[PDB]
Design a protein around this ligand. Structure first.
Ligand code: NAG
Lengths: 50, 50
């Protein structure tokens, strides 16, 4: 019943592809939401241009 | 427990509360009120030969 998020932000100079290397993900926040989750979707930003 | 609490320079992460030693003993503790790191050392003991 705890929704735990771990995060890590690294500067990558690679142009394409998942980098090869090691980086540990420090915890970001844990929330006692206590709900059932089976699916998820990502949200992106939209840049409106003339 | 029981021991000597010495202020220590353990590099505790913000989400870490205590540091178990290799022997899984709580070597260091974060003070709950003042968020500082205190190393715990067992009080002096030894054998006494005559
Ligand atoms: C109360 O505890 C909080 C969190 O450890 C700490 O930031 C604050 O200084 C404490 N204040 C008192 C009154 O001890």
């Amino acid at each position: 019943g705890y929704f735990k998020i771990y995060s890590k932000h690294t500067p990558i100079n690679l142009v394409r592809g998942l980098p090869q290397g090691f980086s540990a993900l420090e915890p970001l926040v844990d929330l006692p939401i206590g709900i059932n989750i089976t699916r998820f979707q990502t949200l992106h930003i939209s840049y409106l241009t003339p | 427990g029981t021991g000597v609490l010495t202020e220590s320079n353990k590099k505790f992460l913000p989400f870490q509360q205590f540091g178990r030693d290799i022997a899984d003993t709580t070597d260091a503790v974060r003070d709950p009120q003042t968020l500082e790191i205190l190393d715990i050392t067992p009080c002096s003991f030894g054998g006494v030969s005559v």
